[PDB]
Design a protein around this ligand. Structure first.
Ligand SMILES: Nc1ncnc2c1ncn2[C@@H]1O[C@H](COP(=O)(O)OP(=O)(O)O)[C@@H](O)[C@H]1O
Ligand code: ALF
Ligand SMILES: [Mg+2]
Ligand SMILES: [Zn+2]
Lengths: 180, 662
RNA sequence: GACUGACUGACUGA
RNA sequence: UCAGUCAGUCAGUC
């Protein structure tokens, strides 16, 4: 019932071909993303050097669902000023500075990053995830849907710029959206 | 600051005054520092009463010589005593007995002592006082350690005779898994642990039974995890095509499918019997099918290009040798092989095709490094040198890895006619680069499984390895870091997972069996040990009498024949030896028979056949070519059969040395 | 940097 | 009791 009450603030989303990284691939009317070993041509400008992809939509509340093929993947939201270059060895940028907020899912445990800090959270078996944000209250909440609903975590903040969703994928991993 | 933690003192308390013992703590328990402290108190106590004292540490891998000479003894005893670290690479400027009289802590590889002891002015085992044996479970049926301990036992029995004395040095030994000698029943494990204690001449096992909570805190059981998999590709069956046709040419009997060991063994024996017959048109075919099977097996283990390189590197050198004699059956191979290998080379370069195991390993390495975030060292254990070098290349080439921060290098042992041999100083520089942290995913073979000391290694991966239980108790150990992961990779085709299960069960058996021997009644322990001591000596006498029987020699009786042809080469008298080591010939017509070939400092000999006989080697100003017996056939004059020997010591013949007077 | 020789251990096979 | 691949240890000649 809680997800049903959420669903009247559901919002449809789509990717941006410019922001897609080299080895990644877009599909299903730009609603599903996969990552392959062989390069899809040179990257060029407008593409994040680190392994992320951003959606075309952004929000000036809102809620949605993302299905994930497997673990070791990250979902989050940032301000429009997210850096697109790489200056460090590790290949994920969400949560390193204050300008974003991310949640990384793995086989063992969950890690929610912001301002370069995060805390271990007990792991979850399910793959499907849900996520909500209210700018008026300035809060961002995550949810695990299977088998039951769990309010995994909440972030308090004040926003002066719109938020754009950004996704981080490994090799051999896939990520799909949902629509209604 | 030798302030030992409590349980180390618990285990070392009995050894601190007489009573030669053993000691076993699990990996990460600082056993080496227990050795340090015991040696310190030994030397201090002997000095107080002003009596001569020395200590020798026996290690069994050379890498560990420098490790234990630089990390642990050196700082903790830099001031009070004189410590010297010797090994098999260092070019000593002084003979060993002068070294022993020169210093008083000697860190050495055991084989050096054993050389210096059977040399009869040498050295006698009574000179020393403390004999520390690191990783002493290798004391077993005629190993390098056991010869030393057998001199010790002969002296002990001589003292038991003398009582109706010459003091014997106190012994200490350090282990992590004394192991069971292939035993399915409790009684046999009990027997084996007793036999080990016997050969070391111990008093007990003395494992910590008081401070259990502290020990369970220091040592971390790492997380075990299983990456297992089992893609259509022509290459395996594409080559099955060619090799099936090659077999059909001579219609040989498989007796088993392809890609597995029995087929390779079968090829070996058929080759041998055919060569004994003289049946050409078959020898070359059998050996080529063997090469193809090896290619399939390498294609199993490593990436595809390495298999293709093995094939082409054999064949092009074959044709190079063959076209030198220029300046029926043979052509049948190349005229097929070259079309098919151009096909292969275009086939193998296509990278979307892949092996199965490598994909799982690829997933593991990159995923796990991505999660670590720059606090991550890894060791990948493998089986063959070639595998090590190939994995290093495959890590370097494809560019996705280098962005996630993996920096890789291969570590193998010194001393095989392939890619490039690593040598001693290169290896030392490699582990030196690895300890600080600019080499991050070290790929190693058996050499680094008992002894490495790296304070931080998160990740230990095992690659398609099958082995006994001690080489599995230690390899988990090398992951001496917190939140460690021991990840096993294999495809179910070969018996790797079933081996994992039996090994784990043998680990349980071994621990319980030590607990069993821990608690015997001392009368029984003493008497069983005495009987066990007697047993080894008597069986050595039996083997020695059989050996002096087996050595039994006219050098002129036999004649050597070529092995791919059967054209007579020479007779025994033409053979001589340089320094009992290099078999060589000086004869002039035997010089006109062969053809040098350079593609060079040392030239390879070739027959008319294209098969190789030996190499040119220059001695004391003579230019002279040698011979290798593996490439010939021996024909007697008593029974006209045909025999092959693998290595020169097999042949019952004794050869004279190169009169040099001519 | 190149070439040899010999002890030894684990795995598989009669 | 014999064969077979594999790793490690030592010793010579350039
Ligand atoms: N008194 C001590 N205090 C803290 N750490 C110690 C102490 N003694 C030994 N260690 C640790 O033990 C490690 C050495 O263990 P070692 O005996 O080499 O393991 P293994 O028994 O597998 O060879 C060192 O890295 C050191 O950090
Ligand atoms: F003595 Al160890 F690993 F147990 F070097
Ligand atoms: Mg040790
Ligand atoms: Zn010939």
């Amino acid at each position: 019932p809680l997800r049903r009450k959420l669903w009247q603030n559901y919002r449809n989303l789509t990717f941006d071909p410019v922001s897609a990284n080299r080895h990644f691939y877009l599909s299903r009317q730009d609603q599903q993303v996969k990552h392959l070993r062989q390069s899809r041509g040179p990257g060029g400008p407008g593409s994040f050097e680190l392994w992320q992809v951003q959606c075309a939509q952004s929000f000036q509340h809102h809620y949605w669902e993302v299905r994930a093929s497997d673990h070791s993947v990250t979902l989050g939201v940032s301000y429009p000023q997210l850096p697109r270059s790489r200056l460090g060895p590790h290949t994920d940028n969400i949560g390193r500075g204050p300008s974003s907020w991310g949640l990384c899912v793995q086989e063992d445990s969950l890690q929610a990053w912001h301002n370069g800090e995060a805390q271990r959270l007990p792991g979850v078996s399910g793959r499907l995830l849900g996520m909500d944000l209210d700018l008026a209250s300035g809060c961002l909440t995550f949810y695990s849907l299977e088998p039951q609903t769990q309010p995994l975590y909440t972030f308090h903040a004040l926003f002066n710029q719109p938020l754009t969703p950004v996704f981080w994928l490994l090799e051999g991993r896939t990520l799909t959206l949902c629509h209604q | 600051e030798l302030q030992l933690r409590p349980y180390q003192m618990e285990v070392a308390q009995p050894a601190l005054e007489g009573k030669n013992i053993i000691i076993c703590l699990p990996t990460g328990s600082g056993k080496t520092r227990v050795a340090v402290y015991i040696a310190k108190d030994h030397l201090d106590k002997k000095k107080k009463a002003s009596e001569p004292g020395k200590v020798i540490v026996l290690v069994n891998k050379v890498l560990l010589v420098e490790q234990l000479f630089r990390k642990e003894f050196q700082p903790f005893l830099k001031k009070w005593y004189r410590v010297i670290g010797l090994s098999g690479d260092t070019q000593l400027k002084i003979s060993f007995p002068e070294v022993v009289k020169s210093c008083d802590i000697i860190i050495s590889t055991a084989q050096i002592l054993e050389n210096s002891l059977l040399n009869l002015a040498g050295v006698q085992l009574s000179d020393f006082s403390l004999i520390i044996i690191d990783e002493c479970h290798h004391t077993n049926k005629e190993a390098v350690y056991n010869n030393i301990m057998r001199h010790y036992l002969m002296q002990k029995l001589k003292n038991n005779r003398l009582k109706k004395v010459i003091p014997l040095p106190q012994i200490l030994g350090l282990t992590a898994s004394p192991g069971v000698g292939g035993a399915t029943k409790q009684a046999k494990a009990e027997e084996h642990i007793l036999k080990l204690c016997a050969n070391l001449d111990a008093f007990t096992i003395k494992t910590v039974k008081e401070n259990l909570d502290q020990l369970k805190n220091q040592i971390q059981e790492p997380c075990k995890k299983f990456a297992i998999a089992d893609r259509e590709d022509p290459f395996k069956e594409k080559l099955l095509e060619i090799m099936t046709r090659i077999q059909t040419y001579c219609q040989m009997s498989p007796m088993s499918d392809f890609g597995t060991q029995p087929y390779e063994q079968w090829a070996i024996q058929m080759e041998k019997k055919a060569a004994k017959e003289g049946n050409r048109k078959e020898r070359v075919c059998a050996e080529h099918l063997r090469k193809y099977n090896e290619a399939l097996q390498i294609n199993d283990t490593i990436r595809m290009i390495d298999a293709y390189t093995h094939l082409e590197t054999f064949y092009n050198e074959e044709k190079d040798k063959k076209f030198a004699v220029i300046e029926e059956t043979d052509r049948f191979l190349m005229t097929l092989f070259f079309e098919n290998n151009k096909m292969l080379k275009r086939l193998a370069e296509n990278p979307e095709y892949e092996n199965e195991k490598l994909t799982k390993l690829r997933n593991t390495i990159m995923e796990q490094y991505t999660r670590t975030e720059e606090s991550a060292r890894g060791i990948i254990f493998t089986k063959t040198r070639q595998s090590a070098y190939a994995l290093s290349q495959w890590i370097t080439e494809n560019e996705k890895f280098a962005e996630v921060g993996v920096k890789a290098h291969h570590l193998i042992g010194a001393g095989s006619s392939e890619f490039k041999p690593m040598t001693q100083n290169e290896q030392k520089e490699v582990i030196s680069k690895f300890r600080t942290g600019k080499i991050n995913l070290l790929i190693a073979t058996t050499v680094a499984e008992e002894g490495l000391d790296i304070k931080e290694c998160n990740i230990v991966i095992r690659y398609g390895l099958v082995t006994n239980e001690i080489a599995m108790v230690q390899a988990r150990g090398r992951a001496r870091a917190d939140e460690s992961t021991y990840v096993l990779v294999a495809h179910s085709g070969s018996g790797v997972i079933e081996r994992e299960t039996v090994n784990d069960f043998r680990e349980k058996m071994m621990y319980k069996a030590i607990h069993c021997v821990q608690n015997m009644k001392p009368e029984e322990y003493a008497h069983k040990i005495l009987e066990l001591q007697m047993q080894s000596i008597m069986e050595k006498k039996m083997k020695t009498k059989r050996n002096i029987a087996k050595h039994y020699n006219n050098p002129s009786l036999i004649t050597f024949l070529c092995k791919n042809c059967s054209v007579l080469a020479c007779s025994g008298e033409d053979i001589h030896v340089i320094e009992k080591m290099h078999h060589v010939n000086m004869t002039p017509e035997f010089k006109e028979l062969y053809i040098v070939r350079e593609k060079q400092i040392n030239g390879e000999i070739i027959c008319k056949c294209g098969q190789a006989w030996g190499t040119m080697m220059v001695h004391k100003g003579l230019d002279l070519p040698c011979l290798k017996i593996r490439n010939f056939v021996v024909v007697f004059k008593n029974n006209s059969t045909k025999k092959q020997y693998k290595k020169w010591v097999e042949l019952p013949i004794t050869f004279p040395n190169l009169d040099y007077s001519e």
